[PDB]
Every structure is written in structure tokens, then in C-alpha cells.
Amino acid sequence: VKKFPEGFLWGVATASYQIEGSPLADGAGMSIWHTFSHTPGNVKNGDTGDVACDHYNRWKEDIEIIEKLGVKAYRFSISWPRILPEGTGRVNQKGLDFYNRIIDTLLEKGITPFVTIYHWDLPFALQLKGGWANREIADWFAEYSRVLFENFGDRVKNWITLNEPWVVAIVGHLYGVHAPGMRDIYVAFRAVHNLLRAHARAVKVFRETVKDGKIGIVFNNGYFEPASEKEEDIRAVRFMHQFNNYPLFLNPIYRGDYPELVLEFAREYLPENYKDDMSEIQEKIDFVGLNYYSGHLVKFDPDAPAKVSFVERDLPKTAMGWEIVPEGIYWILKKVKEEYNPPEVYITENGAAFDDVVSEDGRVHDQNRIDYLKAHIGQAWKAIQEGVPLKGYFVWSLLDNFEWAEGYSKRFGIVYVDYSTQKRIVKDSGYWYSNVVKNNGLED
Numbered sequence: 001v002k003k004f005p006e007g008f009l010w011g012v013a014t015a016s017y018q019i020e021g022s023p024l025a026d027g028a029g030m031s032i033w034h035t036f037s038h039t040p041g042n043v044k045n046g047d048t049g050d051v052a053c054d055h056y057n058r059w060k061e062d063i064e065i066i067e068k069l070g071v072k073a074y075r076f077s078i079s080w081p082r083i084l085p086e087g088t089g090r091v092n093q094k095g096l097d098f099y100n101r102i103i104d105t106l107l108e109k110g111i112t113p114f115v116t117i118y119h120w121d122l123p124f125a126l127q128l129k130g131g132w133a134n135r136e137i138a139d140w141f142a143e144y145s146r147v148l149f150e151n152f153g154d155r156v157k158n159w160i161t162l163n164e165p166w167v168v169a170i171v172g173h174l175y176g177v178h179a180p181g182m183r184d185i186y187v188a189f190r191a192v193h194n195l196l197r198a199h200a201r202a203v204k205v206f207r208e209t210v211k212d213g214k215i216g217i218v219f220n221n222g223y224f225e226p227a228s229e230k231e232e233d234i235r236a237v238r239f240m241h242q243f244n245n246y247p248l249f250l251n252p253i254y255r256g257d258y259p260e261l262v263l264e265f266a267r268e269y270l271p272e273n274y275k276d277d278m279s280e281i282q283e284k285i286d287f288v289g290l291n292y293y294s295g296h297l298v299k300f301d302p303d304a305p306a307k308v309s310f311v312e313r314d315l316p317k318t319a320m321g322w323e324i325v326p327e328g329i330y331w332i333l334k335k336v337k338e339e340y341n342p343p344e345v346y347i348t349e350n351g352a353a354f355d356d357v358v359s360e361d362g363r364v365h366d367q368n369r370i371d372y373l374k375a376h377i378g379q380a381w382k383a384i385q386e387g388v389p390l391k392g393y394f395v396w397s398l399l400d401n402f403e404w405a406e407g408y409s410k411r412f413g414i415v416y417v418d419y420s421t422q423k424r425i426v427k428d429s430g431y432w433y434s435n436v437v438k439n440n441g442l443e444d
């Protein structure tokens with residue numbers, strides 16, 4: 001038996017562009033993911049979010065699935081361009097109506113909404129003005145967040161400014177693999193910095209408009225282990241954790257500067273008086289969300305940009321090719337308490353992509369995902385037993401969905417989606433998870 005604390009929040013998680021479809025319905029502006037995915041060569045098989053899970057129409061039935069499974073919390077995101085089609089100024093009532101219906105439905109059914117304000121679908125109109133590269137985004141984001149607080153803050157009380165700002169900056173602006181598809185290290189570190197300033201401005205306005213709410217921010221994290229016991233490899237691990245995990249943002253938020261190895265690597269790329277912004281960046285937050293999926297063996301490498309290479313290990317992997325290292329989720333939970341001691345933590349995403357097939361029996365026997373969830377939920381329980389203030393756990397994802405540059409080819413859902421009909425098939429992992437929420441923990 002591994003029983004969780006009373007009132008622990010068991011959730012599922014999605015993101016607007018990944019499930020909704022109908023990106024231009026009802027006066028919505030284009031996002032950068034619309035223009036990106038519509039550019040030939042950017043996404044596997046030419047996939048886009050034009051249709052996705054058609055959640056824009058099937059939202060009621062999807063929530064009914066959440067209800068039926070008994071899960072207590074739904075993490076979802078809001079499409080900025082549905083609300084403010086030009087990014088600032090005009091507010092689209094029909095966009096607000098879409099999310100209002102979802103919000104009211106969840107509450108009526110006793111599910112707690114956790115709203116991610118920004119999960120990567122910037123209004124295209126703002127990208128034309130530089131997007132995350134432009135310092136003024138801290139004002140645009142504040143205006144947007146304010147609108148969400150004023151319209152939804154009466155009912156939604158749990159808020160997340162940004163999903164995975166490292167990915168937004170580095171994958172979007174350095175690697176060019178995600179929208180807006182840029183490859184410029186100077187832009188990428190300006191985007192890191194503006195992400196922090198916009199997050200801090202949003203939190204500030206939240207204090208003014210939602211008196212009884214809680215607000216946090218979500219980071220991606222990997223469990224990095226050194227290839228050798230040599231000095232340089234252990235250091236390569238120390239760089240990667242500081243750059244790729246929560247310290248890149250939490251060192252600023254809690255200590256008022258970037259982490260030390262990040263400055264060794266990137267001080268030429270950061271804005272010249274970046275320190276002037278640090279005091280405002282330290283705006284107090286209520287919780288930290290950590291996402292976790294995978295671990296990576298890393299070693300020093302003199303030929304690699306950043307002086308780090310990944311080394312492949314003979315370990316069980318998901319369809320992403322990601323190494324399954326359950327103890328990473330425990331390590332990261334431990335480490336976040338050790339380093340910054342946030343008053344609350346949530347696992348805001350954890351999950352796995354496997355090649356799911358509908359059997360002849362009409363069921364999806366994803367024993368491989370059950371095994372994955374069970375192992376990590378076990379490690380999260382362990383972290384709680386050693387004092388980490390973990391208040392919730394969210395499976396990525398409710399639904400198989402548009403997996404960014406991988407398109408529909410990667411399935412993360414505990415519910416299978418047959419894209420040809422839009423049929424939902426609860427997976428074995430979904431029934432299994434439904435049982436652990438009912439029991440408030442593991443059993444065998």
C-alpha cells in the first residue's frame with residue numbers, strides 16, 4: 001500500500017493547440033503554431049492542429065470522461081489568440097465563451113480547473129512584432145493575463161503563467177524545432193529573460209485581481225547522470241541541471257540571478273543590463289509545477305556546443321526514444337526542496353508515449369504505460385514520505401493528441417483517439433489510473 005495525503009489532487013493535463021482543432025473558428029486570430037505547422041517541412045507528415053482531437057466541439061464528452069474516471073483536477077491551457085486575436089486590444093467574447101463553458105462544466109462536476117495561461121500558441125500578430133524577443137511582451141502578457149483573471153478568476157483559483165519556458169526559448173528560438181522556428185542564441189536568451197519578466201508581471205497583476213487565488217509556473221526537467229565518475233562529467237551534469245531544469249528560472253525567482261554555470265555559458269547572450277530586471281522577477285509565487293519524463297546519461301564533450309553530449313544507454317525506452325528512469329521524478333522533487341524550498345510543488349505532467357493499438361477485443365492494453373505511471377507515482381509517493389510538499393500529480397495526457405513537431409505519430413493519452421472517427425477509447429492505463437484516484441494511491 002502507498003496511500004497519498006488527504007486531499008491530494010489527481011489530475012489529467014492537456015494543451016489548447018494539441019487537442020482543440022478549429023484554430024480559426026469564431027474570430028480567433030492565428031497562432032505561431034498555426035503558421036509554423038502550415039510551413040512545409042516543420043512537422044512530421046505535414047500534420048497540423050487544424051483538427052487535432054476536435055475538442056473545440058467535443059469538449060463536453062471529454063470532460064464527461066474525466067468525470068466518469070473520477071479524476072479530481074484538469075490542467076488545460078487557454079489559446080491567447082482565441083481571446084485576443086491581435087494579441088492585445090480587442091477581446092473576443094466567443095473565445096471567452098468557449099473556456100467559460102468548460103470552466104462551469106468542470107465545477108458543476110466537482111473537477112478542479114488548473115489553467116495554464118501560456119502553452120506555446122502565441123498570437124501570430126505578436127510574433128510579427130518579435131514575440132518573445134521583444135521586451136514589450138512583458139506588457140502584452142500582463143494585459144492578456146489580466147483579461148483571464150477578470151473573466152475567470154471568480155471560478156478558477158489555480159493558475160500557471162508559463163508551460164516549460166526553457167522549451168519556448170531554446171527549442172523555439174535556438175534549435176528552431178518549435179514555433180517560431182528561429183536559430184539564434186542571442187534571441188533565445190533574450191526570450192528566456194523576457195519569459196521571466198512576463199511571468200513576474202502576470203503574477204503581480206494576479207495579486208491585484210484574484211484575492212483568494214494561487215499562481216505558479218511549470219518547468220520541464222530531466223534526470224541527468226554522469227557517464228563516468230570523472231570530474232568533468234559530473235560538472236557536465238551540473239551545467240545541464242542548471243540550464244535544462246528549473247534552476248534557470250527558479251534561481252532568478254528565488255535568488256535574483258541566473259545560475260552560475262548558465263552565466264559561464266551565456267552571459268554574452270543575455271541582455272546587457274539584465275540584472276536591473278531581477279528585483280521585479282522575484283515576485284512571490286505560490287507553487288512550482290515540475291514536468292518529468294526521462295533521464296539522460298551525459299558526459300563532457302569538447303566538440304559539442306555547450307560542451308555536453310548525451311550518451312545512449314541500454315535501457316527500456318518509450319516511442320519517443322526516451323529512457324525510462326522512474327527515480328528521476330523522486331530525485332527532482334528532492335532537489336527542488338533542497339535548492340529553493342517552494343511552499344508547494346505539483347507534478348504538472350508525467351507520462352509516456354507508446355505504440356498503442358486497438359485490440360480485436362476493442363481495448364487498448366497499454367501495460368507498458370501502466371508500468372510507467374505506477375513506477376513514477378511510487379517515486380512521487382516516496383518523495384512525499386521524505387517531506388516534499390507535493391500537493392498533486394497530473395498525467396500527460398487525457399487524450400492522444402498533436403505532439404508538436406512529431407504530429408499525431410506519438411500517443412501520450414490514457415484515452416485513445418481514433419483520428420478517422422474521433423472515437424475515444426479509454427485505455428487500460430486510464431482504468432488503472434481511475435482506480436488509483438479512487439483509492440488515493442497505489443495498491444500492489
Ligand SMILES: OC[C@H]1CNC[C@@H](O)[C@@H]1O
Binds near residue numbers: 164396412
Ligand atoms: O513531449 C510530451 C509533452 C511534454 N510537455 C509539454 C507537452 O505539450 C508535450 O505534449
